[PDB]
């Protein structure tokens, strides 16, 4: 059976022929209560002191108990299970080439990374999850050290010179759809370039970038509160209902598509692209539940360096490791160093027993490095040797969708609600933050009576 | 798209690695999530805390 | 009266997200009912449901 499956192509012998031969059987949960199962065909069925000699079924591989998102974790049995859960949650937010068809798809939100890489330390389940075809993340030289205190708590120190070379750069795509329609008998919406004297309501924004048909051409830089689609509805002389960009977008028009909807009316979709260079506050994560923002970025002359001139791309704090107990992170670093020096791809299937930390250390010691992965680093600012020896190695990190430019918000004065005449809600509506009941109670405990009065009466709506 | 090769999928501007299994309703991709429910036609026996029945069997 | 969230918009942020959304299960126990027994990881989920993949929060 193994040889026939080895020659799977040009023989049409497959899983159905394996099942029909009577060697593989499907067992559900109810029938599972009446069987005896083994991890391993020979390691649990040899001759030793007798535990059970009436086995009825055997596992194919024990690492098939994990799901799709948990099968990308290297050495998941060396981690804490809450950290495995957190990585299974954050693997869905990892940014990368989400599909090979992204240049046609006009999706509302899309993130694509410039240079995705397959992991140096991989699991055998990744081949069936197609992770090496559509990867989400870059292998990075990671040094675990306390350098300047900017990586404290969960923060990350990044290399600015690496970032300038394309490290974790990405494109953010947004699509705007607008549909002209004949809603009323005397109400018609048309795609046209608005003109100031013939349009009843014209905003302070400029309409010069539009064409005569009211649609902006691809390849034009656009910014905050600019006009991309010119739509006007007649007034029973015309009311302008043109759509604008989101605030602080600052993108470039990528593709403009015109078509007819189901009703037969003109339909337009415009895609706008924007590059996202990683910044202070952008969220980065490992494959082991170690998430955190970028604390600061240093150039290559300021980052610590080894004897060979290697500077880490990312410095993480050693305080994250001991409480969270993600030893799989360190084993992945050590295996990644061994794999990068050897020239192979490391294997991190969960229950192997053919890979040990001692074996990986013995493999690393042959290439001229310290067996536990430590190196002697030098101070970037002063050039002096660091007294401690820094654990450094390649580790697969991902970039998450949560960037600080999509979350920064401020409001002095602006729009108010129609009903209660209080400020609006949300970033997109230029809304205000909520001074809730707990904040009111905290100010009561403070005793700041006039501050509490200003927040609840003067900063919000006053009336007579 | 049933039974088509990778070249045919690329000629139709479809990703060969796309697994499918979803619906396109008004242009938006929609997926049906499986819902757990209690199995039918089988006898279960339970016991409630403050109910008047000491033992109850349901089917 | 109808159930909600049976059909959801397919998550297309990354390929792992798409696959995990296409292979997702749901329990119709309400999130407001606050009990540890339905949320616990049972012994019968060996090889049927991933023990690690679950949302954080009310679900």
């Amino acid at each position: 059976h193994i040889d026939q499956l080895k020659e799977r192509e040009y023989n049409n012998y497959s899983w159905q022929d394996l099942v029909a031969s009577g060697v593989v059987e499907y067992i559900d949960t109810l029938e599972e209560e009446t069987v005896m199962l083994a991890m391993t065909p020979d390691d649990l069925q040899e001759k030793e002191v007798a535990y059970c000699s009436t086995y009825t079924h055997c596992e194919i591989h024990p690492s098939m108990i994990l799901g799709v998102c948990a099968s990308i974790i290297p050495f998941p049995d060396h981690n804490q299970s809450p950290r495995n859960t957190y990585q299974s949650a954050m693997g869905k937010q990892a940014m990368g080439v989400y599909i090979t068809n992204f240049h046609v798809r006009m999706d509302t939100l899309a993130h694509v990374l410039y240079y995705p890489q397959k992991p140096l330390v991989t699991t055998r389940s990744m081949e069936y999850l197609r992770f090496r075809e559509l990867p989400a993340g870059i292998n990075s030289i990671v040094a675990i050290a306390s350098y300047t205190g900017y990586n404290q708590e969960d923060s990350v120190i990044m290399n600015r010179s690496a970032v300038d070379r394309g490290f974790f750069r990405s494109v953010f795509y947004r699509s705007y759809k607008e549909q002209e329609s004949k809603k009323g008998f005397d109400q018609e919406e048309v795609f046209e370039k608005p003109t100031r004297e013939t349009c009843q309501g014209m905003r302070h924004a400029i309409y010069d970038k539009l064409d005569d048909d009211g649609l902006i051409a691809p390849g034009v830089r656009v910014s905050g509160d600019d006009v991309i689609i010119g739509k006007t509805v007649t007034l029973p002389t015309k009311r302008d209902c043109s759509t604008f960009l989101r605030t602080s977008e600052t993108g470039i028009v990528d593709q403009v598509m015109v078509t007819l909807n189901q009703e037969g009316y003109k339909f337009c979709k415009i895609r706008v692209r924007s590059v996202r260079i990683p910044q202070i506050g952008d969220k980065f994560a490992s494959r082991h539940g170690q998430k955190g923002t970028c604390g600061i970025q240093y150039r290559q002359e300021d980052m610590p360096f080894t004897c060979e001139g290697i500077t880490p791309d990312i410095i993480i704090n050693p305080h994250a490791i001991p409480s969270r107990m993600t030893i799989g992170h360190l084993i992945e670093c050590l295996q990644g160093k061994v794999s990068a020096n050897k020239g192979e791809i490391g294997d991190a299937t969960p229950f192997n027993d053919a890979v040990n930390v001692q074996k990986i250390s013995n493999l690393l010691s042959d290439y001229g490095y310290h067996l536990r992965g430590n190196e002697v680093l030098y101070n970037g600012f002063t050039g002096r040797k660091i007294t401690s020896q820094i654990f450094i190695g390649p580790t697969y990190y991902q970039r998450l969708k949560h960037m600080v430019d999509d979350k920064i918000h401020s409001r002095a004065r602006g729009p108010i609600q129609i009903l209660n005449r209080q400020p609006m809600e949300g970033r997109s509506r230029d809304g205000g933050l909520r001074f809730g009941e707990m904040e009111r109670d905290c100010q009561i405990a403070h005793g700041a009576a006039q501050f509490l009065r200003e927040r609840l009466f003067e900063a919000s709506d006053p009336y007579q | 798209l049933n039974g088509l090769t990778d070249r045919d999928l690329c000629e139709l501007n479809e990703c060969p690695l796309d697994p499918g299994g979803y619906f396109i309703i008004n242009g938006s991709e929609k997926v049906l999530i499986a819902q757990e429910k209690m199995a039918t036609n089988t006898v279960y026996v339970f016991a409630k805390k403050d109910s008047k029945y000491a033992y109850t069997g349901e089917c | 009266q109808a159930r909600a969230g049976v059909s959801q918009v397919l998550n297309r942020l990354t390929f792992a997200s798409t696959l995990s959304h296409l292979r997702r299960l749901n329990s119709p126990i309400g999130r407001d009912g606050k009990l540890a027994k339905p949320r616990q990881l049972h012994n019968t989920l060996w090889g049927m449901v991933c023990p690690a993949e679950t949302p954080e929060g009310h679900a």
Binding site: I2, L5, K6, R8, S14, W15, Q16, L18, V24, T40, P41, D42, I60, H61, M64, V68, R124, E127, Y128, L129, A354 | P19, G20, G21, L32 | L19, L22, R23
Partner: peptide, 28 residues
């Protein structure tokens, strides 16, 4: 006709055949 020493190759060949035939959205 038994595979005592090499089992990883056989196991992952079987798993590869399974995922080649069925897929990942086969239940849907």
């Amino acid at each position: 006709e038994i595979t005592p020493d090499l089992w990883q190759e056989a196991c992952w060949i079987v798993i590869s055949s399974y995922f080649d035939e069925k897929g990942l959205v086969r239940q849907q």
